[PDB]
Amino acid sequence: GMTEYKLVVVGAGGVGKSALTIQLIQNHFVDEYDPTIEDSYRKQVVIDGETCLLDILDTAGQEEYSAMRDQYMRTGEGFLCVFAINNTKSFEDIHQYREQIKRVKDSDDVPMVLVGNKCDLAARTVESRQAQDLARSYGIPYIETSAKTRQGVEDAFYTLVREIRQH
Amino acid sequence: GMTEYKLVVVGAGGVGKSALTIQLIQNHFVDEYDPTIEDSYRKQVVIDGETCLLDILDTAGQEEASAMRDQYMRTGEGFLCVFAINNTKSFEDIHQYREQIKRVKDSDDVPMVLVGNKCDLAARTVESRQAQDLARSYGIPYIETSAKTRQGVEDAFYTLVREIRQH
Amino acid sequence: QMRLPSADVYRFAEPDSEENIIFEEGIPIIKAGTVIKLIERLTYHMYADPNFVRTFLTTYRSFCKPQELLSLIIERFEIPEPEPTEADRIAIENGDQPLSAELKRFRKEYIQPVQLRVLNVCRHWVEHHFYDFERDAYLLQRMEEFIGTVRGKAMKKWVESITKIIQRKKIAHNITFQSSPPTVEWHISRPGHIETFDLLTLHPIEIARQLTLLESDLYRAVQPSELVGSVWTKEDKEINSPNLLKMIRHTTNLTLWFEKCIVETENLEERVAVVSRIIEILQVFQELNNFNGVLEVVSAMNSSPVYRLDHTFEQIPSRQKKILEEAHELSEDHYKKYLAKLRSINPPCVPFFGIYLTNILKTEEGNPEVLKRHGKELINFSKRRKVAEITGEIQQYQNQPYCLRVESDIKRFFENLNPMGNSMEKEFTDYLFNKSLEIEPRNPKPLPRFPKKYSYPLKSPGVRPSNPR
Numbered sequence: 001g002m003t004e005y006k007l008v009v010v011g012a013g014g015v016g017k018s019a020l021t022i023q024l025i026q027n028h029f030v031d032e033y034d035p036t037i038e039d040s041y042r043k044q045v046v047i048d049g050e051t052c053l054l055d056i057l058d059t060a061g062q063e064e065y066s067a068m069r070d071q072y073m074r075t076g077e078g079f080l081c082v083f084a085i086n087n088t089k090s091f092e093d094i095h096q097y098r099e100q101i102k103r104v105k106d107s108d109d110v111p112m113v114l115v116g117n118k119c120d121l122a123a124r125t126v127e128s129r130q131a132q133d134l135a136r137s138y139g140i141p142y143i144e145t146s147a148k149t150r151q152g153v154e155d156a157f158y159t160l161v162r163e164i165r166q167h
Numbered sequence: 168g169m170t171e172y173k174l175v176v177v178g179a180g181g182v183g184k185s186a187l188t189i190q191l192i193q194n195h196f197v198d199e200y201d202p203t204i205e206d207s208y209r210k211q212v213v214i215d216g217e218t219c220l221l222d223i224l225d226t227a228g229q230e231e232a233s234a235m236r237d238q239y240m241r242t243g244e245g246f247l248c249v250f251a252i253n254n255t256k257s258f259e260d261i262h263q264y265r266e267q268i269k270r271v272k273d274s275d276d277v278p279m280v281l282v283g284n285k286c287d288l289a290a291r292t293v294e295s296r297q298a299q300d301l302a303r304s305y306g307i308p309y310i311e312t313s314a315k316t317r318q319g320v321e322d323a324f325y326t327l328v329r330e331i332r333q334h
Numbered sequence: 335q336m337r338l339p340s341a342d343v344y345r346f347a348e349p350d351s352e353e354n355i356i357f358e359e360g361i362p363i364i365k366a367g368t369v370i371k372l373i374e375r376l377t378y379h380m381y382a383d384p385n386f387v388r389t390f391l392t393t394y395r396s397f398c399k400p401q402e403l404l405s406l407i408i409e410r411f412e413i414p415e416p417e418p419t420e421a422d423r424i425a426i427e428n429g430d431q432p433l434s435a436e437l438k439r440f441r442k443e444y445i446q447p448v449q450l451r452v453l454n455v456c457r458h459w460v461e462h463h464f465y466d467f468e469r470d471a472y473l474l475q476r477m478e479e480f481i482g483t484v485r486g487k488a489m490k491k492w493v494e495s496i497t498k499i500i501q502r503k504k505i506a507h508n509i510t511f512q513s514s515p516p517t518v519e520w521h522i523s524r525p526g527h528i529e530t531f532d533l534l535t536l537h538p539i540e541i542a543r544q545l546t547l548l549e550s551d552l553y554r555a556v557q558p559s560e561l562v563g564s565v566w567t568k569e570d571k572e573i574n575s576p577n578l579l580k581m582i583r584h585t586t587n588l589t590l591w592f593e594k595c596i597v598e599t600e601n602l603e604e605r606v607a608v609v610s611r612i613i614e615i616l617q618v619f620q621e622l623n624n625f626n627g628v629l630e631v632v633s634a635m636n637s638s639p640v641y642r643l644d645h646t647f648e649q650i651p652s653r654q655k656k657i658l659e660e661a662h663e664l665s666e667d668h669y670k671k672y673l674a675k676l677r678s679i680n681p682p683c684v685p686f687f688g689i690y691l692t693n694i695l696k697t698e699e700g701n702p703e704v705l706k707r708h709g710k711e712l713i714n715f716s717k718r719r720k721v722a723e724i725t726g727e728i729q730q731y732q733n734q735p736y737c738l739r740v741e742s743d744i745k746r747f748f749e750n751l752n753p754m755g756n757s758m759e760k761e762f763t764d765y766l767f768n769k770s771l772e773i774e775p776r777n778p779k780p781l782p783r784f785p786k787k788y789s790y791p792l793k794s795p796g797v798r799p800s801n802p803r
């Protein structure tokens with residue numbers, strides 16, 4: 001009964017979305033990387049004692065292909081909506097990503113997580129309070145990660161899996 | 168999957184090694200004479216039902232690079248021996264190239280094709296019968312080509328591939 | 335062996351150690367090194383490595399400025415000759431002339447290969463990466479001065495050649511084919527009558543051909559300078575990646591135009607003819623190896639407004655469901671089948687650029703700029719080789735031209751397509767979806783009826799070409 005979950009990362013480009021999945025799948029004690037090789041987006045993990053397989057889709061770099069977003073999102077059971085804490089615009093776009101996900105999945109209750117991502121040392125413009133409140137108004141978990149120290153990265157994905165399992 | 172083949176083009180200065188290669192690669196006739204030092208090209212192509220990845224090395228013909236040949240002849244799997252049909256000196260030079268390749272690769276059995284380029288021209292000084300005679304003494308095919316009209320170009324390059332394949 | 339210059343009048347003769355160069359576990363492959371060592375290997379005396387030259391010139395700007403590169407190559411170029419040997423001294427002492435054997439061997443086996451390789455880097459630099467010089471006229475000046483003051487007749491040929499080449503690139507291409515391109519095909523719209531041109535009135539064979547030509551040119555035009563350093567994703571992306579972006583925006587346009595042709599065709603029968611014709615166009619895309627085209631169509635079918643039109647899907651002929659489903663399967667499992675088919679076909683083809691973009695991006699964000707070893711900071715060169723492997727695969731498909739005639743009017747028609755008009759994206763995207771809801775409402779609401787909008791026959795001429803004499 002090895003369950004596979006199809007997770008899809010979405011969010012503004014140009015602000016380190018990419019690091020979230022890279023740090024996860026990497027192991028992460030290593031620091032070299034090849035996205036080219038197959039099963040560099042597959043990852044077996046043990047969440048709450050039950051083992052499962054994570055299949056992450058991260059199309060970072062393809063954001064200008066805006067008409068492909070439905071094609072991509074349609075494939076997923078769970079979603080990470082990522083913004084950068086030093087980019088207010090990426091935070092304001094979170095609404096349009098959520099509405100767009102609800103539409104392609106044709107549901108008002110799609111398992112999703114809001115992730116706030118620290119990509120560098122430029123000042124925070126989105127406090128965690130605001131992000132918490134948005135995430136509460138949607139009835140979804142909020143998780144902050146660091147694009148450097150791998151903090152909160154496991155928490156992000158595992159929470160989304162918990163959100164799928166308890167849907 | 169696709170087999171990879173390392174081809175190499177040798178011959179005197181000005182015979183048209185570069186024009187032949189660029190014609191094969193880009194369907195374009197280079198009319199400028201810009202002496203080569205060493206250029207590398209890649210070409211995926213289906214030959215006799217099989218997908219090949221051709222690596223083509225365009226080598227220097229100028230006398231001043233006489234001492235830099237062994238390195239590239241060590242790597243190549245098959246050799247296009249080019250002379251111009253309007254230049255008898257370049258045809259007498261073919262013997263040297265053949266002997267060199269044989270020495271460097273330590274085999275009497277290296278895949279090669281003899282190529283008489285510039286066949287679009289009227290002013291021919293090397294006759295086919297001679298080149299052919301030479302090719303038979305080598306046990307290899309003779310193919311006449313024009314980088315300008317594209318006559319023979321694919322036939323010379325793909326024949327060489329077949330010889331590597333049957334080797 | 336041979337003696338290298340003194341390591342104090344020439345920085346490029348320091349012995350290799352794991353403090354300045356690290357190799358990968360017939361020529362060796364560099365994992366990491368200093369810039370001195372990277373440039374030395376770039377122009378090594380023992381062997382040529384044209385792949386290293388392309389990799390380096392494509393990617394060096396993340397670790398070394400252009401002005402600095404040119405200075406280092408110029409430095410590498412001025413190799414000190416050795417002093418007269420003991421035997422040379424003894425001959426001169428006796429009025430005779432030296433054999434100068436060691437000196438002549440040093441010239442022929444170190445200096446000459448190293449200098450030519452330097453000149454080869456300059457040649458590839460100028461001929462394939464001329465933008466460093468377009469964006470910095472001083473750098474161009476320095477380069478012309480260097481090349482122009484190179485004395486020595488073993489170099490003369492290439493010095494003169496490289497001088498002309500630089501001059502050409504400053505103040506600045508036709509094609510030959512094995513066969514003749516097929517006759518341009520016409521359906522309802524006849525030549526000249528561009529006012530009638532539209533999805534169903536042009537020949538589906540000729541829609542595919544001309545979109546494929548157009549999309550091939552857009553693909554062929556993107557240079558690695560638009561990709562290296564992830565610049566298409568940054569704030570100056572419009573400045574740095576204008577061809578990549580033009581290409582993507584065309585793909586988006588076409589995908590929305592497909593969505594729009596469909597959902598604005600309110601009569602069911604008419605809309606089915608529309609979808610079926612788009613699937614026929616997709617079919618000629620597959621024949622033509624235009625994978626960008628294939629996925630423009632597949633993205634359109636999978637979009638929110640179109641995917642939900644169950645009544646329409648239901649009437650698509652079986653053989654065309656099959657074609658659409660096969661194309662859609664190219665995209666499954668992180669493009670597994672697409673990648674295998676792309677690596678399988680006989681070019682010309684038009685790849686989907688999005689996979690390449692994501693790979694370059696992750697390679698760059700997933701690998702460190704430097705490796706720290708023995709307290710030294712080595713350039714992580716394998717990282718740059720990975721990016722260059724990708725830009726090389728891209729360039730490999732940019733070489734082959736399609737054997738197809740341009741039709742000026744049809745080409746201008748597709749260039750000028752502007753489905754969104756003056757509307758922003760969410761406004762237009764919401765419009766398309768409402769059209770989808772109007773023409774095939776959610777259950778339990780009943781299916782309305784709608785009048786024909788097309789006055790011309792809906793029958794497809796088919797996707798098999800024809801041949802008069």
Ligand SMILES: Nc1nc2c(ncn2[C@@H]2O[C@H](COP(=O)(O)OP(=O)(O)NP(=O)(O)O)[C@@H](O)[C@H]2O)c(=O)[nH]1
Nearest residue numbers: 180181182183184185186198202203228285313314
């Ligand atoms: N008529 C004609 N001219 C040709 C042909 N091939 C090459 N040329 C011309 O002959 C000249 C030399 O071509 P080129 O390919 O540069 O020769 P090369 O073998 O590369 N020389 P090098 O050894 O210096 O690199 C150019 O002016 C080119 O246009 C051919 O088939 N026909």
Ligand SMILES: Fc1ccc(CN2C3=NCCCN3c3ccccc32)cc1
Nearest residue numbers: 609635636640641643646647658659662
């Ligand atoms: F006229 C059309 C054509 C397609 C559609 C949407 N659609 C697909 N697109 C890609 C392949 C599989 N696929 C479907 C399967 C089952 C139902 C709808 C489907 C909707 C109306």
Ligand SMILES: [Mg+2]
Nearest residue numbers: 184185202203
């Ligand atoms: Mg040449």
